[PDB]
Design an enzyme around this catalytic site. Structure first.
Site, PDB file in Angstrom:
ATOM      1  N   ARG B 121       0.667  -1.308   0.054  1.00  0.00           N
ATOM      2  CA  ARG B 121      -0.161   0.073   0.167  1.00  0.00           C
ATOM      3  C   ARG B 121       0.558   0.979   0.060  1.00  0.00           C
ATOM      4  O   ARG B 121       0.769   2.254   0.849  1.00  0.00           O
ATOM      5  CB  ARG B 121      -1.047  -0.081   1.623  1.00  0.00           C
ATOM      6  CG  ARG B 121      -2.293  -1.145   1.542  1.00  0.00           C
ATOM      7  CD  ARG B 121      -2.685  -1.217   0.116  1.00  0.00           C
ATOM      8  NE  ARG B 121      -4.222  -0.114   0.156  1.00  0.00           N
ATOM      9  CZ  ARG B 121      -4.968  -0.198   0.352  1.00  0.00           C
ATOM     10  NH1 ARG B 121      -5.538  -1.031   1.633  1.00  0.00           N
ATOM     11  NH2 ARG B 121      -6.474   1.266  -0.334  1.00  0.00           N
ATOM     12  N   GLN B 126       0.609   3.071  -6.517  1.00  0.00           N
ATOM     13  CA  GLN B 126      -0.472   3.211  -6.221  1.00  0.00           C
ATOM     14  C   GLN B 126      -1.310   3.227  -7.159  1.00  0.00           C
ATOM     15  O   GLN B 126      -2.866   3.122  -8.066  1.00  0.00           O
ATOM     16  CB  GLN B 126      -0.867   4.705  -5.856  1.00  0.00           C
ATOM     17  CG  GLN B 126      -1.872   4.896  -4.687  1.00  0.00           C
ATOM     18  CD  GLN B 126      -2.255   3.453  -3.920  1.00  0.00           C
ATOM     19  OE1 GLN B 126      -3.735   3.813  -3.489  1.00  0.00           O
ATOM     20  NE2 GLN B 126      -1.672   3.101  -3.115  1.00  0.00           N
ATOM     21  N   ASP B 129      -2.717  -0.736  -7.277  1.00  0.00           N
ATOM     22  CA  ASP B 129      -3.719  -0.294  -6.307  1.00  0.00           C
ATOM     23  C   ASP B 129      -4.727  -0.738  -6.027  1.00  0.00           C
ATOM     24  O   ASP B 129      -5.782  -0.140  -6.515  1.00  0.00           O
ATOM     25  CB  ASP B 129      -3.196   0.683  -5.210  1.00  0.00           C
ATOM     26  CG  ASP B 129      -4.097  -0.266  -3.972  1.00  0.00           C
ATOM     27  OD1 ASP B 129      -4.537  -0.464  -3.832  1.00  0.00           O
ATOM     28  OD2 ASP B 129      -3.285   0.648  -2.882  1.00  0.00           O
ATOM     29  N   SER B 132      -7.439  -0.016  -4.407  1.00  0.00           N
ATOM     30  CA  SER B 132      -7.490   2.108  -3.915  1.00  0.00           C
ATOM     31  C   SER B 132      -8.717   1.768  -5.077  1.00  0.00           C
ATOM     32  O   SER B 132      -9.726   2.729  -4.996  1.00  0.00           O
ATOM     33  CB  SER B 132      -6.758   2.895  -3.982  1.00  0.00           C
ATOM     34  OG  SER B 132      -5.835   2.490  -3.094  1.00  0.00           O
ATOM     35  N   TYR B 220      -2.938   5.014  19.093  1.00  0.00           N
ATOM     36  CA  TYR B 220      -2.928   3.768  18.954  1.00  0.00           C
ATOM     37  C   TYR B 220      -3.447   3.411  20.142  1.00  0.00           C
ATOM     38  O   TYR B 220      -4.719   3.057  20.360  1.00  0.00           O
ATOM     39  CB  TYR B 220      -1.684   2.233  18.891  1.00  0.00           C
ATOM     40  CG  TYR B 220      -2.077   1.062  18.978  1.00  0.00           C
ATOM     41  CD1 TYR B 220      -2.401   0.212  17.862  1.00  0.00           C
ATOM     42  CD2 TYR B 220      -2.769   0.308  19.668  1.00  0.00           C
ATOM     43  CE1 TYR B 220      -2.547  -1.092  17.156  1.00  0.00           C
ATOM     44  CE2 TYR B 220      -3.750  -0.963  19.758  1.00  0.00           C
ATOM     45  CZ  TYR B 220      -3.259  -1.569  18.642  1.00  0.00           C
ATOM     46  OH  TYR B 220      -3.736  -2.895  18.203  1.00  0.00           O
TER      47      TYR B 220
END
Ligand SMILES: NC(=O)c1ccc[n+]([C@@H]2O[C@H](COP(=O)([O-])OP(=O)(O)OC[C@H]3O[C@@H](n4cnc5c(N)ncnc54)[C@H](O)[C@@H]3O)[C@@H](O)[C@H]2O)c1
Lengths: 364, 366
Positions: B121, B126, B129, B132, B220
């Site tokens: 990713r 891209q 991808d 996406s 996180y």
């Protein structure tokens, strides 16, 4: 007794989703000094629950109880078993279509009621706030494009993607009246490249103002032939066609033939807004989507406003409020019919049991 | 030969195809020949003759599987696995982590497999991808689905029958799909609001016209704490009381989707609101969601949980996805050669290659 009470019945016509008032119009009706009884569930299909009407100041009723109102607002004309529940002195406001319904007209006259036909509002500028036909045609243009987008297999909207540029959809709108202008508008919001044609050149400037191309030709036929050649040429270039063409007092002209559709790019969509009058398109099956052999979806729904019920009910119910603002100038819950006002004269098709349609000739 | 085969997708109800006439032109410029199985593009509106115009050959039945390279959308079903001949390179969605049985069966056929879901990713990938491409389409389509089900104008306007306000749209999650949804809702003139737990996306969301929603409040740990989760649920409960359309996109492959919109919140919405749950395939972010259907609540909310949004824009999804494949192949075939080199020094090829010559090579290193 229920003077100054407006009754809003549940629509009985098959598959009707609209209602003649919403919680919002009800607040307005009470400001005019009326009370409002809504039949339970009247607004459910339009997303107006019993409880929202009650919150707006309406009373929910159950039976024929709604029919014991001095005024009844509806979308569709009443059926036989409704007509028999109308008491003398009652004023009914709904679509009527007197020309196509002479027996309906006689049965209403026999109840000794007053009737205003929302279809018979004269198309003058001051009457625009009561013109239900414009209201509905506007919704229908918007919804036409929503249906087209639903069925179309590509982006309407142009776009730069990591996986390539995508061009915008190309949309031709036939007829740039109220519905066609709404459709142009909706298509523009989705970023389409829009083209329009209308026989009335006076719309040129509105169409171009919306960033749309007003198409030109090379009347009274042989004007038709140049118009058809335009549509044949365009049909091979565009993805979406929205056709809205009616002529008052006639069937819908076939403007898009089976050969035009057959020439289009596979996956194309046609929304035929003249379907209820037979459609502008030769492949149209009123009430349905028809898919041609070359992969074109021909959309022929006859109920585009009922496929946007909440908005249709809102605007129609505002139309009726605006008519009642004419009839109740003192805001005291009392109706006064003034036949000197050509708008009221147009709309009033029965007056206390006497048929008053057709209105004397007017200049629109 | 250097022949690429495009089969008809047989997963029930699939409408996408792995190549279009436009991508077939590009495949040929890379030195390949192409056969397309008859009918493969039909549901995506590309008929046989449109493929022939582009320079592909039409074949019937399983002749398509006698190609050096097979490009598909979905993984081979059971009676397709046997049809792979040794030395064939397969390119499709695979989802190795979630299908070890499939991975074993493919390995025996002694093929090379590239999972489009395993594309790293990152920056330079891209254009390849597929996750996406498919998310972007899904975000846009979600709003078309919302508009179809909605009973009101999306777009504010003033009529002589009065002024109509714009629809109010909340988008939960501003990754690829969520941003696509923001964009389509803004194009339609809505008041659009968006929440994402990642603050970096704030400026992206704002630039597209949307309000970036803030909480009443390492990263996180913050996002997993009871306090943050109570504040996020509080935000959603309040927005649900005032917006008309919610689009939820919080979905991690292989993990069940978090329930962000409860029955209670939906029950508070105005009648005729629409929720579009793009996490439906993993159970949905909304508790009313019935994956694969529209569910209507008692209070009149439409909860849209179709799991196939890209296949409800089949022509677009096939065009973009086929372009991602073309781009994988440009990377496999640098000399425009008809020949593929599985160069494991290129991290993107390393990442996508989940089987090689019969050896499971997934998962790739960090
Ligand atoms: N005064 C006002 O503010 C106002 C506002 C709205 C409507 N109106 C009136 O209502 C009436 C009808 O409303 P409408 O404008 O929506 O029309 P409409 O619904 O009857 O038809 C839509 C359009 O189709 C067009 N058309 C007919 N045949 C065509 C053809 N062969 N090719 C291309 N286009 C064709 C018409 O010219 C029209 O513009 C008009 O008299 C209009 O003036 C008045």
């Amino acid at each position: 007794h229920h003077h100054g009470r407006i009754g809003i019945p549940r629509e009985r016509l098959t598959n009707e989703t609209r209602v003649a008032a919403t919680p919002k119009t009800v607040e307005q009706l009470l400001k005019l000094g009326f009370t409002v009884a809504v039949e339970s569930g009247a607004g459910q299909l339009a997303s107006f629950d019993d409880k929202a009407f009650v919150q707006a100041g309406a009373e929910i009723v159950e039976g024929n109880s709604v029919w014991q109102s001095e005024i009844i607002l509806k979308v569709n004309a009443p059926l036989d078993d409704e007509i028999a529940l109308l008491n003398p002195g009652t004023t009914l406001v709904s679509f009527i279509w007197p020309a196509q319904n002479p027996e309906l007209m006689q049965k209403l006259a026999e109840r000794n009621v007053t009737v205003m036909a929302m279809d018979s509002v004269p198309r003058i500028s001051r009457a625009q706030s009561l013109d239900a036909l414009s209201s509905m045609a506007n919704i229908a243009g918007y919804r036409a494009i929503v249906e087209a987008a639903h069925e179309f297999g590509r982006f309407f909207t142009g776009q730069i993607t990591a996986a390539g540029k995508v061009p915008p959809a190309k949309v031709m709108v036939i007829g740039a009246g109220v519905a066609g202008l709404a459709a142009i508008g909706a298509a523009n919001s989705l970023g389409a490249i829009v083209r329009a044609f209308d026989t009335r050149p006076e719309v040129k400037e509105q169409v171009q103002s919306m960033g749309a191309e007003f198409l030109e030709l090379d009347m009274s036929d042989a004007f038709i032939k140049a118009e058809m050649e335009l549509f044949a040429a365009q049909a091979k270039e565009v993805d979406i066609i929205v056709t809205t063409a009616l002529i008052p007092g006639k069937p819908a002209p076939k403007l898009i033939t089976r050969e035009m559709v057959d020439s289009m790019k596979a996956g194309s969509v046609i929304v035929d807004l003249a379907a209820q009058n037979g459609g502008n398109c030769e492949y149209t099956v009123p009430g349905e989507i028809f898919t041609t052999e070359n992969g074109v979806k021909v959309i022929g729904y006859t109920d585009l406003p009922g496929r946007l019920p909440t908005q249709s009910s809102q605007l129609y119910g505002t139309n009726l409020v605006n008519l009642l603002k004419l009839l109740c100038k003192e805001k005291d819950g009392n109706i006064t019919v003034d036949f000197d006002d050509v708008v009221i004269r147009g709309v009033t098709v029965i007056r206390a049991g006497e048929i008053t349609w057709p209105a004397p000739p007017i200049q629109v």
